Amino acid sequence: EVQFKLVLVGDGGTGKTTFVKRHLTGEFEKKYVATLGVEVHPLVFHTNRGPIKFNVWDTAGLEKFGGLRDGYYIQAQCAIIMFDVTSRVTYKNVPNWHRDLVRVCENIPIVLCGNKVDIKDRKVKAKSIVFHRKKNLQYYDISAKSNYNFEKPFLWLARKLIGDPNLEFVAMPAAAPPEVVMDPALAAQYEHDLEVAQTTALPDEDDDL
Amino acid sequence: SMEGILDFSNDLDIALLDQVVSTFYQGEGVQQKQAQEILTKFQDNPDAWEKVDQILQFSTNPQSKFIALSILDKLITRKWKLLPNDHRIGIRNFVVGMIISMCQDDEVFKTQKNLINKSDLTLVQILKQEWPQNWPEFIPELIGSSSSSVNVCENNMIVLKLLSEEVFDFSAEQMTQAKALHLKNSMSKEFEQIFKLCFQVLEQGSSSSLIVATLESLLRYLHWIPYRYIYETNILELLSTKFMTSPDTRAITLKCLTEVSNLKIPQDNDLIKRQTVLFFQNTLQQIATSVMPVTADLKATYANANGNDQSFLQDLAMFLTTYLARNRALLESDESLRELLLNAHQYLIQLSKIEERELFKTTLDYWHNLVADLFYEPLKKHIYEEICSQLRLVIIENMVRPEEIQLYKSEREVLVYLTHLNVIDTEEIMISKLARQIDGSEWSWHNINTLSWAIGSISGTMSEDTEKRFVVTVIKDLLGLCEQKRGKDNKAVVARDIMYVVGEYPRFLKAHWNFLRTVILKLFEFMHETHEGVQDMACDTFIKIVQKCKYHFVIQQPRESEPFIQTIIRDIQKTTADLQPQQVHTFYKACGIIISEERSVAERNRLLSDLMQLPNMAWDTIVEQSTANPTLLLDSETVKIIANIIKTNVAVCTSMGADFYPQLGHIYYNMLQLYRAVSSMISTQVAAEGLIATKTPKVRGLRTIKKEILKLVETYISKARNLDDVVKVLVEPLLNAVLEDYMNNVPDARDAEVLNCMTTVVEKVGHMIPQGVILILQSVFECTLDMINKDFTEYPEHRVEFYKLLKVINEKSFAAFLELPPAAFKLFVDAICWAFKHNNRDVEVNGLQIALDLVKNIERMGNVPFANEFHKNYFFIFVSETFFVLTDSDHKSGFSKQALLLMKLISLVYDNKISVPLYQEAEVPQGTSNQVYLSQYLANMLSNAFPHLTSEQIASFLSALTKQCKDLVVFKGTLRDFLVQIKEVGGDPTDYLFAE
Amino acid sequence: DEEVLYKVRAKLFRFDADAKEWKERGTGDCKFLKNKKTNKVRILMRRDKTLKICANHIIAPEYTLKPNVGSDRSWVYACTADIAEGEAEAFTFAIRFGSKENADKFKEEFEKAQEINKK
């Protein structure tokens, strides 16, 4: 297992924390709770070349919650720059995030990600997105909500950091799960907990799943 | 213990800071997290800057010193001008001294690049503040200190690179226009001496790290310096030969030559043209001899991803496309330059084969430029024949599906141009690729799909005769392919592609009725195939063919007994029997397209009658049972049937618009009774089961009925031609059925689709129903506002539809707002300002537009009491609310419309277009002009909101603003200058005198 | 080492009692796998693209599939021991499918698997 420091940067509400949380737990957080300074989470993928661990430094996009700002970028080995394709200002700000990042990290693989491509009224058109070309950034359209291309930023960075272009995500063998006996002392405990959960609606009942 | 550094009453323990920082950067979990919070509180302490010089002197952690410089940078950029001159000179000296010291120690220079670069940026922040007016000798001393040491010279190149970026590349948003111009003129005035130094280092050579830093600074200079520094020195030769040969300098040099290719250059000068040719010749010669020949497999190289190969090949693509899009005409008329021209294009052909979507798009943009040129420019296509032949194959093998709209558009346009240039070569490549599908050598689902999309994309480029032969050959071959293939997966893939191709050649279908009939009847057969994707592609192909060939379905074709639309309708039950509801609706939508071609009213109404036969008979029986027994609606199966009848009506109304009226008229009464009956059931369910009821499948089903009814009425009214019938037949029953139901439901049961329907009604017939618009406001205004005025998040759909409704009422029926009681009108002004404060761009933009339109609505009323009372009550609320969202840095997307609103408000007073005093009496002399009072009010408001500004800054700003209130671009300039100045202390009040 | 008895596309949620909300855990192929040594049938579910495990538990005979108030194409059930995220934990799960038909078929197969597991 090798570990790499990954810095995630971009304007407030572009979907940085939502994207990371989806990768960590599988969940989709609908609410906007602005990151304060930085949130650090280990994230592990299983590849045909063994496990790879990203130490993910999810930084604050809002100026008032910026904390150490470029202080977070020190010794980063890779980066994602995030914008919102429903918000033109967030793409206008991509050169500013890139500037602040590369002044600290001169020679690292960087992915530019246009998030929220699931939303019908797209404001930053494909034709407009060219900033990555002269800066040698990889670019992906992503949706943390629909999971469109949600694995690509990490698959591309893993290939760059391992120096293997043929690297793939793989399924690890699944251990036989334990047989257990329901605890007769916690049986009344569980009918309660199940009552609450049966009578709370599942989210997004209109989706394909 | 870590929290010790936050205690400022005691001197700072550097060894503790160093541990906190180490904990943050190298620690984990709970410890990392806590160190993080402590460091942020330390940095944000407004006296923390005092500790910087101590930390820089006595810390052993380079991360501590980095964070110290961040703290210093906050002071320099925000509060520098508060410092006595002696203190500013002190800070300047301890920064310069730290930089020189670090550079003179070879070990530290090698290993502490982070801290040196951060120090260099800090120095540049001081230069932005101090230079040149309070530091005239900076550049001479930098040039002087550069000969003392290779490390200092190299670091000086990093400083000049960052200075150039800060002054020319990033100044627009970060400085006043006046300050940006001052620093640009200042660097321009001293550049001669900077360039001399850069050229000497490049000529004298030796240290690769120094040369690379120097070319990195040159890349920045090329954004702004005059061409003569490049064309009237040896630098073009050095860049295009020496620096292309060594791989350390090759990547930066290529980037420089790309920017050289974009210089502003004289057009009528043969020596400059020859120099432009020569640097290209030299660069391509160095690549062919030192990197790879023209024949090299760049697809393979890129895939292998060795070292910096990917970045180099991207940079080569950028250089070739940039240079050729500007200069290829220089290479086209001279026989001696033919080989250079075709080798450069041959490199682009090889780069275009790289498996990398974003690189492909870059090269495709160039190819589009070129083939568009060859289509129009005389005597040029013959040059590029072999390049274009290769490119035909690259585009055909790379064709994406039409769902990827921008990429498919680009690819189609290139392939269309190429097909015009050589139809025979395009045909030969497509037929031979089809042959390799049939012989199995290149067979795969992706490969037959790709080819089908390419064949589809050139429809309409060939002559009708050539198209005919081509289409027949392709369908014959794809049919052979289908038969040949085994198992349903393979057969489905080829069947879908046959359908796809046929659907893209309407000109062929329109000439061959017998073939078109066969296609349709075959599509009807496929609508019974349950194999995944077949029914969807059959329905998609049907509606696509109808959109294009609808006229051929509505006439009687020779040797047919009736128009084919009659034949479709007659067998509709059987045709659609195996389809999912959404597929059935597409089928009926397609029949609607055809029927709308019939312009004989009697015949059209009869076709519509016959098409709607099955949903109308299903409806009639349900309505009989629904009226007979109200309990029957509760049944899940009935709700799904009713929803699907309404959806069928929406589908046919979508394609028939105004023509759909007789069908709407047939169901209208009982549809609105159903709306009321379903509404009762929802209310009843929510009472019995609680708010959770709204999540249940039953209540979602019932709400679906209401939403589809609202959708059907908005669909019809948005396209209606006879507005008299809309107002006289549809509107009264609609308003009676929906408005009171919306008002008297609990928030969670209210449909945002009601607001959307009402928006279309006011849009189309608002002028004709003044009492209806009043009733709409009374029913939806205050109850919807109360749902959305507690936070920015709840009821997002209601939020959006609410401001769209207010916007159209304010445009079309402003009298409805005059009829409001004063309390209700005050809530309307509250609602508009509330919209201003939103970050969802939909609401904010409607908010600011309503404000504009309302001002215009009031101004129209002329000198009357309502207008006079409006200004007295609300002028200052709008001015201050607009200033609030302009300045709080939380509403930057709204900048343009905020400025437009502020300009209109200020211009009303500057023009004396407000009849009464805006001040209440004995607040100023009773003679006082509104202009004097507005000036006073704004000076006071800005002074309290921004107490760090001087009286001089505020007065200068407001003087400029009122003078520029007829010139939006200049006004916006002044506003942006103000937004820069409020982020710092001691902004120059003369900045507001700026003129371009 | 396992026979695939049933495969269906599904979205899996776990109930967060603290936040009193359903949190999605993964979307992908839900598989009923019969261990060829023990004849024990488990649910193994992998996320699309990452192929990371979001469900790994025995289909215990004592488990009961219940409706969710919001859905006609979902089941909720208490799981005493799931090993998807390492160490065995108890979860309240909800699994949602493309159709009521898919959910009913799942239920049918889940009961069959419960009977196989009774042996």
Ligand SMILES: Nc1nc2c(ncn2[C@@H]2O[C@H](COP(=O)(O)OP(=O)(O)OP(=O)(O)O)[C@@H](O)[C@H]2O)c(=O)[nH]1
């Ligand atoms: N429709 C849609 N919404 C998304 C998507 N990704 C995130 N969101 C939502 O948009 C918001 C993003 O919030 P965050 O992920 O906290 O944003 P952030 O960039 O981390 O914000 P800061 O911490 O302020 O820098 C939340 O409301 C998300 O639920 C997406 O792909 N599609």
Ligand SMILES: [Cl-]
């Ligand atoms: Cl992980």
Ligand SMILES: [Cl-]
């Ligand atoms: Cl793009």
Ligand SMILES: [Cl-]
């Ligand atoms: Cl690229």
Ligand SMILES: [Cl-]
């Ligand atoms: Cl200049």
Ligand SMILES: [Cl-]
């Ligand atoms: Cl040209």
Ligand SMILES: [Cl-]
């Ligand atoms: Cl026609």
Ligand SMILES: [Cl-]
């Ligand atoms: Cl019949």
Ligand SMILES: [Cl-]
């Ligand atoms: Cl129907």
Ligand SMILES: [Cl-]
């Ligand atoms: Cl009222």
Ligand SMILES: [Cl-]
């Ligand atoms: Cl309010």
Ligand SMILES: [Cl-]
């Ligand atoms: Cl203000």
Ligand SMILES: [Cl-]
């Ligand atoms: Cl300030």
Ligand SMILES: [Mg+2]
């Ligand atoms: Mg965040």
